[PDB]
DNA sequence: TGCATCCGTGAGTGCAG
DNA sequence: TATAATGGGAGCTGTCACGGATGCA
């Protein structure tokens, strides 16, 4: 959903 | 039109000069508190504790009491509103409130009642009515408490007109988007199909047929085009005829006689013109009390004709219209 | 109201066909200097300037009075468009 | 003249200071006058103690201070600055490891100060911070709208200081918990706090219903710190649940009193609600290693016992005024302050853990600007920072007392239902029920009751006298709506002997319901009728004869009353007209006893008994936000011996110290030949003659001279191609001369600007080659006057740079402002109104010879048509005239208190005493009755106004007592066939004058992308022909007229340019091409990868770009 | 509120403008597919013409909102409401708007097909008899 | 010729390129000194 | 933008950027705010004010509104007489208010002869928020509305304002005079009833003069002979209108 | 298969601003 | 251009009603 927690 | 226009400036001119020399005014002394009032006010309290006792003696409930406390006070309001107008027409028939309301120049019985009699039962914020009515008149003057109680109602109507408007407006825009392409594109689509306007409404009171209200029949019939011959009270109304306002009043009379129950009429529910309607299935250009000119954007007219009233529709109210459209 | 409107609506089959005939004729006159008018100098619409009476400039006032005279023909497919737009620039030049 | 008062109510306390909500609140947030030692942790201070100290190296907070302002209020007003104070804050940095101590006092920027009348100057423009109403911090219970017998519980903190949490008990028996819209079983949480299965029944132990249902040991099979990680899973799908980060999350959501603050109010509310004291404004604690709950179990207690039947577990009326509360200005600005401090700390720790951990100071570890911009922001673009309403001194005072339910932290328009807008039973004596706006904002913006005040917790409360036994004390006490509901409170006007309750029935409310009750049962009494209504509403005489819906317009239109040069206070008043001028801080008074030394159009100096020579100077002809001359005039003469508190100068709309929003005029109430139609008003030319309804107005006209890439802009008197006529009123520099007459077209300031890459084209170079004048390189960019404006140059400000004092936005050399005055007589189109909701537009001005007049030759001033009254039901205006008749012949004014004023006998008595003056004067001056007065009386008798068989004087007497008099049409001398109502009425000029509103355009500016004409008078607009108008033209079948509005008149640039050549040339207008705005539509769909194609009938494209986009 | 039935009818008639298929007979249509009642009655002629089976259909009652969004003209429908849903679906089908109704021509800015703009009246000519007779005489002989 | 319909349909990438006059290579607007458009950017006039 | 996930805001505010679909759609979208209706040239606004002297087909247009709204036409006529040498100098006369000479107004009066303007009032609920009028010039700012048309517009004079629109082509002029002129639009298109019709003062004036007194003095006596009835009334015992 | 349940889309006009 | 440094940070709250597409006993 949240494209930063994804990459994190 | 030309003459009615001149006729109209004419009524404009004289009606205006007369209005001023006539001597019409408003002084506090024109709000005639009829004296029948305190009879009815006294007559109420006794019957009020006439019910505060069939409960004081635990004879029946609060849901029972309230139910009947407020039927008392509403038919009381009726009484004094009457005595206001009886007292006017019998004694001071040239009083300015009476004149103004009676002609249709302003005012109506329920406002005028609140100048002269009592204000009445007021609303509580919820939607329930106060069992205490404000008995003060506007001539007499309200108690601060009466003034406050009376405040909820007005605000709850202020909010009403403000939200509601949004819906009337929105509703109108839908109506235009769904009818706009509808124009009067040809003279006759040759359809052999029609609709039968009833002059009778099948009751459940007698659950027999009773005649329908005149204005309602005028609105199903005025300016239509008969799709079949009709012969009533020796008159012959022919296929193709645009029912004039008199053709209408006639058929109501033929129906009061028993010669007719429903009139076959060329409706646009049955026009077969593509993308529009034809002349016959439409009828008059009501704006001109004559058959409609090919080219009239009827669909847009329709929409403006249905939307413009709702502002202005107080509940169901306008909701029910929307739930239907 | 417009002088003699109820009879205008009587000539046409639909009120909007009057409007188009009027507005068309109205402009035949504006470009041509009225010379094609089918009025006589007493029927001429006249306005009143501060100096004195003068021919009405409003080509529509004209067109409508003209229509009442009967001295005009209305209908569809009566001429080639370009045979008119010069036979008239011939009979009454710009 | 003499002033008769009516009314039997002895009002114990006065109206309180009517700006207190604005002044008390701010000063209580600054404390700029409290010795720092003695300050108190609320407001500006409290924010400091919240954000500090900054944590790993540790930076701590000592104290703050405030300096006086760089410039005084007026100075900032003129120079478009802000009236602010410097904010210094003394800080000590200490090193987490060594003992480092540095200590500086670092400048944080300027805080904007509040003037005496309780407003603000922000970029040199007075503004007001409207209090905000919102639900109040606390815990509430409310029935579930789905399942009739189950109830949600809600936990609400101050806005943006915590999350909302709901406790709906699901249809599976065990209780739920919502946070950031995530549901999960409650027990998991109670575990984390250290809870044991038994200490639950040990505390609930009643409701085997669900006390026993809430328990589910799939969860109990864990220690506290176990479920603690159990839950972090439930709110962070993806974050690794390390026990240093899961404690960090919940703590930072439920116990960290640094982003979770229940109100200070919220503590007390849920405190007394749940019957438990509270350590801090915080749900949970972190004490001795783990979590120690404070609120969740108490809340849990209530909810359950409600869902069975328990006593004292009521739902809550969330619209009650014990559960709604007010964010006054001080609070609202501190919130923004707690947000600058918050950002500033994000940036210190950033430079704490990078840059040098030992050679650092408070000075360079703080960048103030994040604070600066948060303040600047709240004051320059908030929805609660409003351009001040200083139309007249009341409009400014009413503003400061306004209440918005809207705004950041409140409701969006769409959020607003009914219940927020309804009048609440508890508004009684707190929020006026009349003064609200008609339209969308109805019931969101409201006004502060006149006697009401907001307490330290932010609740409105209202005073009531205590009645004990049956006798009424003078001890007044202010109650929140909650304690109010405890008592039986009798009405303001219950009749007394001395201080005992005479009546045997008393008219009282319990919990706002109206009850009839004996004086033994009565505990308190209203203070005054004035305590239920707005300030404006309280200015309305005979309010109790006016329907509510037009008392409301009467209230609001006041604030729109234009200050009149001959303004006068109403001949009928309510007894507040004086205070209002007082607190309006616009009139000018005497500080102590003394004597008047000098007096002058410009200043007033007074020698005091204290030997001081105080010199008050006079704000003479100041322009207000709305253009309405704010002018102070002196009301004492040299030597006048003045006690303390007496008047020295009249403000605007003040006449010897009474609020003068309009003028008293002789009013006749009758149709008048059409010019009365549908609320239009007819007036006597005599009103312009004696300069009634005339008002001074000023418009500022600014211009800037700026540095360009093509040259500088010059403010000159040297403007090419312009005739000495066109310059005769300009000084050598290019400024109009103070004291001139400027009208449309006139240059006020010459300005020159350099010509671009259109330096003359061939067509133009050649044309000048003929005229022996070669291309000039500068341009006339002067500032002219716009259409429909003009006046008398009153003043000019010239700010250059290179001069002292001054420095302007980058790239501007000099700016010039020129203020222009206009005297405005009343005129056909201006709008008039009276305090009863009667409003109309002056439709005709007759010469005095046509005005109706009375037999003794006097002509009426105003003719108001009676058709206005009946349907509007605002009878009070009728009384206002009758008693105004009397006062016009006895030379009297009256004070009729609202709801406690002059009744009908009391005024009919006055109306007789006036009759003798009006007529007896006559029968002695050699004139008897008149022949037309008998013809009228003949008629009046048929009507039934007069008693048949009675002397003319007897009968005229009878009509006079009715407010009615004989009236002669001045066009004929013949009487009005009837007797009319003539009297004296207070009637104001409203801000809505035709001069501000007549506008028209042939052609003008256009819009960048759409090429359609701009909007608004100031842009030289065009008129929006919207969807509904298009429909109109559509319904008529006006095809060509519609097409015109859609092409030639808006954005068919070809045929538009093509037409305005055809008109000027006398040729019919060209048939139109495609609107340039449809093209914009095509290209905007292309830019979405959508291929829109115009096609001829044989289906092959049509280039509506005439090849300009083909290749 | 006196208000002539004919107005409501016109609207209602649009509410009933569409129909649902129930057996495609011998056509490319599909059970459940919705379309204008005109367009199925239209080709059910083309099918009684080539003698094949006719489409079984069924009356559909839509409300006003849906009935406008379902109109043929994607320019009317897009400018109404639900612009992207309207616009995507029309682009996919390469919908070509015939410009039959009013909004369609309002956005293009052409003469609307009503009133003075109605094909029934817009083509009318007006000539004075002293120019109609003028031009009919030369054109009698070649 | 005379517009009589309005077609709307999908843009093939080739077609999008069929429209284009320029690939906007740089995210530059206009030169911070010349105030003229930087080339290969959103206002480049060669495109 | 905004459609999926977070919306792209610029730094230092929370304001979604305006995506191409945002441009296209909504009440402020391109369709509803620029295609189905634009702003327009040759149009003005002002306060309305009742003119009872007006004839049904007329209105009161401030001459200053008139000058601008017809500025092209005035410029030409100003030449076709000679109040200026050419059109461009004619325009510079009317640009500063001092330079306007009296025969400009006689020149305008010439201009608007016969042609009508359009009046619009606030909510155009139906076809008759717009009607057409021959304008007669007037000093002063306010527009003059005819009392008969106030109902259709729902106009009173608590401060209402109205919009003015000059048709331009001979076709638009012919449309307004024939189809949209007030006097031709007397019946409602919704009910077919009349819509221009007496209202507040006008009926009050006629009711008064057409009511009849009913007096109570005589109270219905029985007299056999007129001869004596009069006498009784001359006695003062029986009021003139008693039945 | 029938029915919760979520996601997305609407929510009057013009003028002042 | 070179100590060593290795998974973010702020949610936002009091509308509503309908229509369609999806999940679930
Ligand atoms: N949000 C609003 C507010 C007002 N108006 C216009 O202004 C009119 C409101 O005036 P009212 O006084 O409320 O209505 P009247 O019909 O004039 O009342 P009355 O019978 O007492 O004259 C309605 C409407 O034409 C509007 O369209 N939209
Ligand atoms: Mg109005
Ligand atoms: Mg009204
Ligand atoms: Zn048909």
Author numbering:
A (entry chain F): 78 to 85
B (entry chain D): 924 to 1238, 1254 to 1263
C (entry chain E): 2 to 95
D (entry chain C): 1 to 56, 64 to 1118
E (entry chain D): 1361 to 1502
F (entry chain D): 3 to 49
G (entry chain D): 584 to 826
Share the article's original sentences.
RNA polymerases (RNAPs) synthesize RNA from ribonucleoside triphosphates (NTPs), whereas DNA polymerases (DNAPs) use 2′-deoxyribonucleoside triphosphates (2′dNTPs) to synthesize DNA. The mechanism of discrimination against 2′dNTPs by the multi-subunit RNAPs (bacterial, archaeal, and eukaryotic nuclear RNAPs) is poorly understood. We identified a conserved Arg residue, β′Arg425 (E. coli RNAP numbering) as the major determinant of the sugar selectivity. In summary, our data show that the universally conserved Arg residue plays a central role in selecting NTPs over 2′dNTPs by the multi-subunit RNAPs.
To test if the unavailability of the 3′OH group was indeed responsible for the destabilization of the TL folding, we solved the X-ray crystal structure of the initially transcribing complex of the T. thermophilus RNAP with 3′dCTP at 3.0 Å resolution. The structure displayed a well-resolved density of 3′dCTP and β′Arg425 closely approaching the 3′-deoxyribose moiety. 3′dCTP was in the pre-insertion conformation unsuitable for catalysis because the α-phosphate was located 5.6 Å away from the 3′OH of the RNA primer. The overall pose of 3′dCTP was similar to that of CMPCPP: the 3′-deoxyribose likely adopted a 3′-endo conformation and the 2′OH group interacted with β′Arg425. However, the TL was completely unfolded, supporting our hypothesis that the unavailability of the 3′OH group was alone sufficient to significantly destabilize the folding of the first helical turn of the TL. Indeed, the TL is partially folded in most structures with ribonucleotide substrate analogs, yet was completely unfolded in the structures we obtained with either 2′dCTP or 3′dCTP. We found that the kcat for 3′dGMP incorporation was only 5-fold slower than the kcat for GMP incorporation and 10-fold higher than the kcat for 2′dGMP incorporation. These data demonstrated that the sequestration of the 3′OH group accounted for no more than a 5-fold inhibition of the 2′dGMP incorporation by β′Arg425.
